[PDB]
Structure 1
Amino acid sequence: HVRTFADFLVYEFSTSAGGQQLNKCIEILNDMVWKYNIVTLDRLILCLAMRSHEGNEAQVCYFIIQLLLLKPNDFRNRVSDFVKENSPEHWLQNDWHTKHMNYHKKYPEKLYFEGLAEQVDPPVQIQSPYLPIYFGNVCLRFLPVFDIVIHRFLELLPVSKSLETLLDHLGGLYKFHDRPVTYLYNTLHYYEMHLRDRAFLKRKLVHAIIGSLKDNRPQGWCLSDTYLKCAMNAREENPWVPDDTYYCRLIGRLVDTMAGKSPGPFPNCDWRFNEFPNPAAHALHVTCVELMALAVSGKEVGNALLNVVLKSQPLVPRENITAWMNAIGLIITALPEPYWIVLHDRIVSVISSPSLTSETEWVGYPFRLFDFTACHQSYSEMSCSYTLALAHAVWHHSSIGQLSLIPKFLTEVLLPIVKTEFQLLYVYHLVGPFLQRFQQERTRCMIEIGVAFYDMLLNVDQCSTHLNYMDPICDFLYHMKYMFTGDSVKEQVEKIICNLKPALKLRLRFITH
């Protein structure tokens, strides 16, 4: 019923002339919703916001919501009193019932068309007994609708200023929100495309949510000091671009929280009544929220996060770097796609290094050149070891959805670049360990990786005179055949096998069967 009326109202407002008519219409709408209490405000606004209009009708309905919220003084004189006489912490106090009585007697609530009953000229009285109400009011019933209408407003482009004024006037409602941080995280991660260009709106949103609850919670619970000091101020066409020390501080807070410290960078809380079961989860969510809300594009942020460990950087001591790898992987996997997509370009850059193609001074094992545990002694050769370690760490903490993007990259980009055997060994070391996960969850990816490996071997064999490490390669191929792929990749293998050099053909007879 209410949705059809909501559609009628927006259609009427799409045909209503602007001026005094609009003001009187919004006033009489306020009167129906509250002066007679025909319908609770939350249901009516949810019905208005659950429309699928196209063109200017969406703007008309959005503007009608805006006029119904902020123009009306009566709605405001309730949320301010509620947020001034109540606090989110309920388990720590014993005098809540009388405060509820005071608030409810200040503003009576009618749910059985009471106000509509009194206004009738004949005397109409309601005699249906109520039911026990211990926690209910209009503000808490309206709060989820407020969140959903914030989402609807972000879906459309020219209604940014309405969002700004709505937040600036009703930021106090979120003092009682049960899970505000996760709401921010999901909202910012879901609308990244629509918010990469509007940095001011994103800054306003995050600032309002954090400053809503800046009094009850202890100091430094969500945001860092440097961000609350520099970037908190209004922009002046010179957005605060950070140096590497800021990123180093963020990663250090996460590894200190996860490792376990008695003082702790984050003050302790009662996890029984919070939304985050563990300190580690809370730290991960707040770090992701703070890093994702910057005005810098994703590529530079991701590149800086990677360069925290790649480049020679103090404040990161040795014999502890695996924890830093862990923190980087956990943070970068939760960020949206434009941030973590830079690792492919990093691998492409390192595979084209001169030390892999021409400078092959090291005639010994390349097997120990790629073992990062050799960092125990001072053998961190080049970025090859560090990039290999980060690729392993990032792909370990990633889901199958992120890993499914690997075979296309392997068969499209790296295929026409690998010429020598060291690059082939590098890609083998890079891809090998995750065949288990691939076979568990997606067999098509397994087929693609097998055929890509065979094609790469053929290209290297055609373009290279000889292979000094053919025995490990043959052993690895036999292991892959007898463990993971079984006998599924058969038809596409004989054509590649038949064209190889006679020694490889002699040592790969059993592959075809």
Structure 2
Amino acid sequence: LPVSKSLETLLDHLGGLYKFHDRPVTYLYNTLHYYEMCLRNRDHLKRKLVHAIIGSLKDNRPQGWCLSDTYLKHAMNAREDNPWVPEDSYYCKLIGRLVDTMAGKSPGPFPNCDWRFNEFPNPAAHALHVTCVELMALAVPGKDVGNALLNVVLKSQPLVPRENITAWMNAIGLIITALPEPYWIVLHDRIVNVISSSSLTSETEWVGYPFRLFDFTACHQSYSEMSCSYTLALAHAVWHHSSIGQLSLIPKFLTEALLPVVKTEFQLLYVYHLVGPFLQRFQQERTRCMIEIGVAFYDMLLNVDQCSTHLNYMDPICDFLYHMKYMFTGDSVKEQVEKIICNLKPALKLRLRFITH
């Protein structure tokens, strides 16, 4: 840690290193993979490396990077504690910039010099590393990234509009699929642990009608805006954006944590809303885990068979699983599911006696 100030002075003597391209995304990822959890020494190093990297990047005059200068103007004194407190509203401005990158003030200060040599196929490419360097400042982010995002979602700041929300959804999806693993890893417990069992077991409320509210786009009015709905929306966003390698850990996840949480049937509809619409992404390249997902759902059946008196909307799940089998898996997982569906309820047997065939 201590003599690292000498290499800081050295890079100050080597500003020319950053006179060609600003692509520290990979240089932070590969050197931060297992570091965010144990960054304490690197945290104290960044305590002084913040201004060092800022000046190293400042070897230009397009006045394009403001979030760094915004932190600088917000870091006049005691830079170890203050600039990380009001981040949510700050993040608003952050996501604000992003929600202005696609439809807003397009000819802004961001695209310039020269739109084709600063690695500009799109302003989001520049959004990448600025978001990275912003969230790489402290250590409590990454764990706090998804938390603050969910906050600015439900604790909607007066700057966050409610009509063009889907742009913000795409924005959060991009910023999540851009940041490394210890940053988006919080979304698992953000969806399954926070609200998926808020009360949601037997006497939740008269809100039990699942279809009209649990699916998104129901909050088109100022009414019909449930927290579970916005949570599912944030989910689907991060699912579609990160549909490259982040989804690859999802099957085991469902087998690890989603088992002792499913109690009621609308919990089953919720986890279906979470998992289903992205299975074809696996089918494209990751077929080898589909069966897992399959039996995962099948395992859920067992639960919704034990602690359950009656099933009102069961036939939706029946035909859902039917087309799950016939359109995607086919005669592939027959032997594994044979030993698991034998424990179902008489109605489920009467529904899936052709599935077992």
Percent identity between the two aligned chains:
96
How far residue 307 of structure 1 moved from its aligned partner, in angstroms, is 1.6
TM score, norm. by length of structure 1: 0.63
Per-residue deviation, residues 462-508 of structure 1 (Å, max 9, x unmatched) = 22111011211111111111101111111122222222222221121
Tell me the secondary structure at the aligned position of residue 198 of structure 1.
helix
Q: Is residue 334 from structure 1 mapped to residue 334 from structure 2 by the alignment? A: no
Paired residues of 2:338 and 2:356 also in contact (CA < 8 A): yes
Structure 2: gaps spanning 5 or more residues: none
Residue 196 and residue 328 in structure 1: after superposition, are their counterparts in 2 closer, same or farther (change >3 A)?
Answer: farther
How far residue 428 of structure 1 moved from its aligned partner, in angstroms, is 1.2
Paired residues of 1:175 and 1:212 also in contact (CA < 8 A): no
Paired residues of 1:174 and 1:209 also in contact (CA < 8 A): no
Written as runs of structure 1 = structure 2, the 5 A alignment for 1:404-419 is: 404-419=248-263
Alignment match, 1:141: none
Paired residues of 1:371 and 1:385 also in contact (CA < 8 A): yes
Q: Take 2:145 and 2:124, find their aligned partners in 1: how far apart are those partners?
A: 22
Alignment match, 1:356: 200
Tell me the secondary structure at the aligned position of residue 188 of structure 1.
coil
Residue 405 and residue 214 in structure 1: after superposition, are their counterparts in 2 closer, same or farther (change >3 A)?
Answer: same
Paired residues of 1:196 and 1:297 also in contact (CA < 8 A): no
Q: Which moved more, 1:260-269 or 1:315-324?
A: 260-269
Instruction: Choose which of 44, 64, 67 in structure 2 pairs with 1:223.
Output: 67
Paired residues of 2:25 and 2:132 also in contact (CA < 8 A): no
How far residue 184 of structure 1 moved from its aligned partner, in angstroms, is 6.0
How far residue 364 of structure 1 moved from its aligned partner, in angstroms, is 6.4
Paired residues of 1:333 and 1:394 also in contact (CA < 8 A): yes
Per-residue deviation, residues 87-123 of structure 1 (Å, max 9, x unmatched) = xxxxxxxxxxxxxxxxxxxxxxxxxxxxxxxxxxxxx
Per-residue deviation, residues 132-167 of structure 1 (Å, max 9, x unmatched) = xxxxxxxxxxxxxxxxxxxxxxxxx77534423322
How far residue 362 of structure 1 moved from its aligned partner, in angstroms, is 2.6
Q: Is residue 493 from structure 1 mapped to residue 337 from structure 2 by the alignment? A: yes
Paired residues of 1:438 and 1:445 also in contact (CA < 8 A): yes
How far residue 319 of structure 1 moved from its aligned partner, in angstroms, is 1.2
How far residue 289 of structure 1 moved from its aligned partner, in angstroms, is 2.0
Per-residue deviation, residues 232-262 of structure 1 (Å, max 9, x unmatched) = 6564676653342111111101110222425
How far residue 315 of structure 1 moved from its aligned partner, in angstroms, is 0.4
How far residue 295 of structure 1 moved from its aligned partner, in angstroms, is 5.0
Residue 222 and residue 192 in structure 1: after superposition, are their counterparts in 2 closer, same or farther (change >3 A)?
Answer: farther
Q: Which moved more, 1:362-371 or 1:327-336?
A: 362-371
Paired residues of 2:111 and 2:123 also in contact (CA < 8 A): no
Per-residue deviation, residues 16-61 of structure 1 (Å, max 9, x unmatched) = xxxxxxxxxxxxxxxxxxxxxxxxxxxxxxxxxxxxxxxxxxxxxx
Alignment match, 1:452: 296
Instruction: Choose which of 212, 226, 229 in structure 1 pairs with 2:56.
Output: 212
How far residue 219 of structure 1 moved from its aligned partner, in angstroms, is 2.0
Q: Take 2:198 and 2:282, find their aligned partners in 1: how far apart are those partners?
A: 32
Q: Take 1:327 and 1:292, find their aligned partners in 2: how far apart are those partners?
A: 18
Paired residues of 2:74 and 2:83 also in contact (CA < 8 A): no
Q: Take 1:178 and 1:496, find their aligned partners in 2: how far apart are those partners?
A: 54
Residue 349 and residue 176 in structure 1: after superposition, are their counterparts in 2 closer, same or farther (change >3 A)?
Answer: closer
Structure 1: gaps spanning 5 or more residues: 1-156
Q: Take 2:269 and 2:258, find their aligned partners in 1: how far apart are those partners?
A: 13
Per-residue deviation, residues 376-402 of structure 1 (Å, max 9, x unmatched) = 123344310011001100010013321
Residue 421 and residue 332 in structure 1: after superposition, are their counterparts in 2 closer, same or farther (change >3 A)?
Answer: same
Residue 366 and residue 304 in structure 1: after superposition, are their counterparts in 2 closer, same or farther (change >3 A)?
Answer: same
TM score, norm. by length of structure 2: 0.89
Residue 359 and residue 205 in structure 1: after superposition, are their counterparts in 2 closer, same or farther (change >3 A)?
Answer: same
Aligned length: 357
How far residue 461 of structure 1 moved from its aligned partner, in angstroms, is 1.0
Instruction: Choose which of 312, 319, 336 in structure 1 pairs with 2:163.
Output: 319
Q: Take 2:108 and 2:213, find their aligned partners in 1: how far apart are those partners?
A: 38
Per-residue deviation, residues 427-486 of structure 1 (Å, max 9, x unmatched) = 111111011011111123101111111111122112211101121111111111110111
Q: Take 2:55 and 2:301, find their aligned partners in 1: how far apart are those partners?
A: 59
Residue 476 and residue 270 in structure 1: after superposition, are their counterparts in 2 closer, same or farther (change >3 A)?
Answer: same
Greater C-alpha Rg: 1
Paired residues of 1:188 and 1:292 also in contact (CA < 8 A): no
Residue 192 and residue 230 in structure 1: after superposition, are their counterparts in 2 closer, same or farther (change >3 A)?
Answer: same
Residue 171 and residue 416 in structure 1: after superposition, are their counterparts in 2 closer, same or farther (change >3 A)?
Answer: same
Residue 489 and residue 267 in structure 1: after superposition, are their counterparts in 2 closer, same or farther (change >3 A)?
Answer: closer
Q: Take 2:279 and 2:65, find their aligned partners in 1: how far apart are those partners?
A: 41
Q: Take 1:409 and 1:185, find their aligned partners in 2: how far apart are those partners?
A: 23
Paired residues of 2:173 and 2:234 also in contact (CA < 8 A): yes
Query: How much is the aligned-residue C-alpha RMSD, in angstroms?
Result: 2.8
Tell me the secondary structure at the aligned position of residue 452 of structure 1.
helix
How far residue 303 of structure 1 moved from its aligned partner, in angstroms, is 1.1
Paired residues of 2:263 and 2:303 also in contact (CA < 8 A): yes
How far residue 179 of structure 1 moved from its aligned partner, in angstroms, is 5.2
Residue 267 and residue 230 in structure 1: after superposition, are their counterparts in 2 closer, same or farther (change >3 A)?
Answer: same
Residue 504 and residue 271 in structure 1: after superposition, are their counterparts in 2 closer, same or farther (change >3 A)?
Answer: same
Residue 302 and residue 292 in structure 1: after superposition, are their counterparts in 2 closer, same or farther (change >3 A)?
Answer: farther
Q: Which moved more, 1:376-385 or 1:159-168?
A: 159-168
Per-residue deviation, residues 311-332 of structure 1 (Å, max 9, x unmatched) = 2321011211101111111011
Residue 231 and residue 511 in structure 1: after superposition, are their counterparts in 2 closer, same or farther (change >3 A)?
Answer: same
How far residue 187 of structure 1 moved from its aligned partner, in angstroms, is 5.3
Residue 495 and residue 293 in structure 1: after superposition, are their counterparts in 2 closer, same or farther (change >3 A)?
Answer: same
How far residue 309 of structure 1 moved from its aligned partner, in angstroms, is 1.4
Residue 452 and residue 178 in structure 1: after superposition, are their counterparts in 2 closer, same or farther (change >3 A)?
Answer: closer
Instruction: Choose which of 384, 388, 405 in structure 1 pairs with 2:228.
Output: 384
Tell me the secondary structure at the aligned position of residue 309 of structure 1.
helix
Residue 500 and residue 280 in structure 1: after superposition, are their counterparts in 2 closer, same or farther (change >3 A)?
Answer: closer
Paired residues of 2:25 and 2:128 also in contact (CA < 8 A): no
Paired residues of 2:18 and 2:59 also in contact (CA < 8 A): no
Residue 476 and residue 184 in structure 1: after superposition, are their counterparts in 2 closer, same or farther (change >3 A)?
Answer: closer
Q: Take 2:225 and 2:15, find their aligned partners in 1: how far apart are those partners?
A: 53
Residue 342 and residue 457 in structure 1: after superposition, are their counterparts in 2 closer, same or farther (change >3 A)?
Answer: same
Alignment match, 1:185: 29
Paired residues of 2:143 and 2:182 also in contact (CA < 8 A): yes
How far residue 186 of structure 1 moved from its aligned partner, in angstroms, is 6.1
Residue 297 and residue 183 in structure 1: after superposition, are their counterparts in 2 closer, same or farther (change >3 A)?
Answer: closer
